[PDB]
Enzyme design. Structure first.
Site, short mmCIF file in Angstrom:
data_model
loop_
_atom_site.label_atom_id
_atom_site.label_comp_id
_atom_site.label_asym_id
_atom_site.label_seq_id
_atom_site.Cartn_x
_atom_site.Cartn_y
_atom_site.Cartn_z
N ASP A 106 -19.76 1.59 -0.81
CA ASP A 106 -19.79 0.66 0.32
C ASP A 106 -21.19 0.69 0.99
OD1 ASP A 106 -16.91 0.09 0.16
OD2 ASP A 106 -16.48 1.68 1.53
N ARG A 113 -23.81 -0.90 -1.31
CA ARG A 113 -23.72 -2.34 -1.23
C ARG A 113 -24.37 -2.84 0.06
NH1 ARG A 113 -17.65 -2.22 -3.44
NH2 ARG A 113 -17.79 -3.03 -5.53
N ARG A 119 0.82 -1.21 0.00
CA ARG A 119 0.00 0.00 0.00
C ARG A 119 0.86 1.26 0.00
#
Lengths: 331, 331, 331, 331
Positions: free
Chosen positions: D165, D168, D105
């Site tokens: 998010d 969903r 990352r």
């Protein structure tokens, strides 16, 4: 010889049975607002209009037909004969009796019963499998009347109830908080009118309970006077009627939102009027608004909202008032 | 703290400059049909209404505002003072006297000229950069009057003209031929009124010229009486007025079609009212409908239609009639 | 004491039969552009996807499902087994074999025939009343193949044909003339590919024939080279594939427009591929693009365009070539 | 005597500044899903695409343009040179190296900062007054990076954050409860990824708190294991990528919904990433998702959600982690 035959070779003959048809009964300002809203949301492939005065009915049909280039609903029909309504998926009732000075509550309802005794059997005859959506006032009683006369199961008889009341509430919340009505949440339930119930415990923005944030919400002694927001909702039709003579646009949009849930089987939750005996503590055949799951088979489920004892007592008192009128009606 | 302050932290002090504002002048039946159609097509981020009767104006504003949950236009405002119209991109003028049953639109000119003397300077003061869309009748003469009073360049002063006449013509064509109006093509030009001109040479389906296929088309000596379809177009407003007293829905949809081309800069072609000096043998400042390219700067181009000797002579006499009225006007 | 049971009281058991279901066969780039365009136009109450690659199929289904909040299509399903497609109104075929390095046309068609021998009987078993829309190339031959295998009447077997070709032509017309494609009119007919027929006589803006204004239109020695606009159309897919690897967006939008005409019963006219025996001088069982009236029962009528000798000879030449291949196929 | 000049009379010379322009940066699968969703919602009058691959850029532009007949966005442009993006109201950033399991990352932050050091200054040169919407991952860090590089005030720099998010999550709620996602309410806040915070106290249907009904909601000892619904959300992108190779459709629909709130000035509340210093106990310059009021000036207000001690501590830990990465970046 004929131009149509020189231009077009026909390959298939005419068996026209409509597939996504809606009927509006009544071409007053409410009915025509329902009609234009349904047309601009492409909810039907055929729209039928019915009423008892033939000239205004035909003129309204022609005016809509002349806009066909700008729409996507290819057939618009009308007539006083209910044969024009055959095979509707959804029939929306907006017609009713005109109010008389000095007449009693019971007399007004009975005059609307006498009208429904003609309308409802005609509707059932030509669309035996339709859903009924009653808008005519007083809506909770007249939804019961349509249910009684039609013989339909309760899932197929729906009253527009408190759907617009709740939309008005969310708009007024939004005006106070500086946010769109879409992002303000709150429910008005019960009898459509002066005794509807604002469920303070459910009001929120982004899941944040306004009552927990501001505990005196919903009490008369609240310095921000949020109780008068509910009073504004119950008085809204009165103020608009006094300014322009009637209300139309907002009920048309609310009714088209209900028709969208039905025609597309969305299973959204709406505060609409349903036969409530056996639920919420009610023991009589009355219709009241609760949050209902709405789709292609009408009302299939009801949300069980937790109410305070004060809130439950309002509903039960409304149920008593409604049954008191209904048991005196002559069918 | 106030509930709003407990719930919401303000991060930005905003100034309200709207970016896609539309104003409707007049809240009669035509004005409100324009308003609901523009709202259901998401053409504006702010809608203003202006008229002279304050109670009726406020009531219509409130009714629309009550439907906000179902719309995507977040601000609806109104008032008698034209300050509420400031910074509009498009201002639609619908106020004025309407035709009685069987009355010529030309009989309205003196009454509506006097009203425009008040309206147009107020609109120009608060939106000096807007486009003007005239709907009030007689629309061709009143577009000229608006152009003279405003001082705007001619590309920004538009009349709704024959956009609706042509939409009616295409609907009636489709009914005779069994196809949607979208797939029937044909143009009505000239005066929005009794002297309009049907251009028979351009009528077609899928590019097939109907006159070449059916040479009698448009003459009295036609068993199928297609000349009578143009008569139906000319008589349309009279027939609807005879049945319901006025027309609304179709003109509202026609006006929203024009507003969509303007706001989205589409450069579609519409038959609308524009200044035609130098055209078809015309040397005076008359306005009438020809096919115009319509976008965000108004009318940028005009299509030069080939006319028959008879068609051009019909345009020229109608232009002479309009000029006969215009040169006597006092404003 | 499940949460669903504490929250919701069920009132009605339901065996759900969808009322406006669409299936897309093939989830390649073309199939998924059709799916997203159909979803964003609110044409269906259930969408089914089917393909032979299980993982890719499930991933596309899940990606679409996660957008449900933003859509008005409440059920999206997928699977390799065609039972998921049951009760579709409309089934769109995009699956097939891609052209191979060094392979004849008879052998590429045969590879696609073998794919259709599995797909089409499965579709028919679960949706015996549906309309079939074939998009896979070569579209005119594969539409014939689908018709033969299905046993459907010719009105319910439709090829996407020259619909996108004509939309590309109208866009390119608009670019040259400075007007939106909506206001440019023109038709490409016949066999989809290098031998399609641009009908110069029907090209117009506002009903003004371009051929009468510009007699060189459609000739090789045209100083403005308008014939090269048709060449651009036939080369378009070729040029886009060379730039980005495939074509998808435009065909998806074209297919959703056809689906709109069918599902809303619009009876609009489109240049699509239909069984043309007995019309336009054709004597064998072939499919070619002509302007067809399209609605809820598929293709009900055909427009008879007046063609030149050369134009008719091009169509006859295409029919002879198609029939020559079809008689060599192994069913 | 060119055809265009015989057909069209020009009345106005072109000076065109678009009024509702949107640019999408990056034409990978995410960028193109944003583009098609914005086009099918009529949010812009001009769409620009920009990226570093000239061939693919031109191919995507051409494919979209060829569908113009079916759209109402009349101008689509593209190029590697950012002059094509001039005068955009809204610029959507989707370019960068994509998140991949196994790739550090911290290394990806460095790779994408350098990409933004090239992109952001080019965007601001040509659209100094635009709003920036960052979609590229890691989204909270790259929104901060765009803010530092542009120097824009914080209201005008927005990250897509936890918007998808939460969408969903509402879909998965609806599947468990038997109602549409539109009628299920719930919020995922904080850092987009594995450490996001599902706010159990705000989850409700019709204003009925699920946590009050079901006090173990969100706990390990929950017999229905609703915590595993949040795990499903955080894992969704990875599962879809494993199945079909990437994720695109749902994010496109989510981004177009944010674009609608901005372009129409709706002031709806979305869980998106904003500079939250001074709120929620955070003291560093970090961006995380909270419920934000979104309109034509970007993010103007933030909702203050009442959090538990544990939820409040999670947000602080996220803020500490983000600033630890950010403190070493050089602008």
């Amino acid at each position: 010889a004929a131009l149509k035959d020189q231009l077009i070779h026909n390959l298939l003959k005419e068996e026209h049975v409509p597939q996504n048809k809606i009927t509006v009964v009544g071409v007053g300002a409410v009915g025509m607002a329902c009609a234009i809203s349904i047309l601009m949301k492409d909810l039907a492939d055929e729209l039928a209009l019915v009423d008892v005065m033939e000239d205004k009915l035909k003129g309204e049909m022609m005016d809509l037909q002349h806009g066909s280039l700008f729409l996507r609903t290819p057939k618009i029909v009308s007539g006083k004969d209910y044969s024009v309504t055959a095979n509707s998926k959804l029939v929306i009732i907006t017609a009713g009796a005109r109010q008389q000075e000095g007449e009693s509550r019971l007399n007004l309802v009975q005059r609307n019963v006498n009208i429904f005794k003609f309308i409802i059997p005609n509707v059932v005859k030509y669309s035996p499998h339709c859903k009924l959506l009653v808008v005519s006032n007083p809506v909770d009683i007249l939804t019961y009347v349509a249910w009684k006369i039609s013989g339909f199961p309760k899932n197929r008889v729906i009253g527009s109830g408190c759907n617009l009341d709740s939309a008005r509430f969310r708009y007024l919340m939004g005006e106070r908080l500086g946010v769109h009505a879409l992002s303000c949440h709150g429910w008005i339930l019960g009898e459509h009118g002066d005794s509807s119930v604002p469920v303070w415990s459910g009001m929120n923005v982004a899941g944040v309970s306004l009552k927990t944030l501001h505990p005196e919400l919903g009490t008369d002694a609240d310095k921000e006077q949020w109780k008068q927001v509910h009073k504004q909702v119950v008085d809204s039709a009165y103020e608009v009627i006094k300014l322009k003579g009637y209300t139309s646009w907002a009920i048309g949009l609310s009714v088209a939102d209900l028709a969208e849930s039905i025609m597309k089987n969305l299973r959204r939750v709406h505060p609409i009027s349903t036969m409530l005996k056996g639920l919420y503590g009610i023991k009589e055949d009355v219709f009241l608004s609760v949050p209902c799951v709405l789709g292609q088979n009408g009302i299939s489920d009801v949300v069980k909202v937790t109410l305070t004892s004060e809130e439950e007592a309002h509903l039960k008192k409304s149920a008593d008032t409604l049954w008191g009128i209904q048991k005196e009606l002559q069918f």
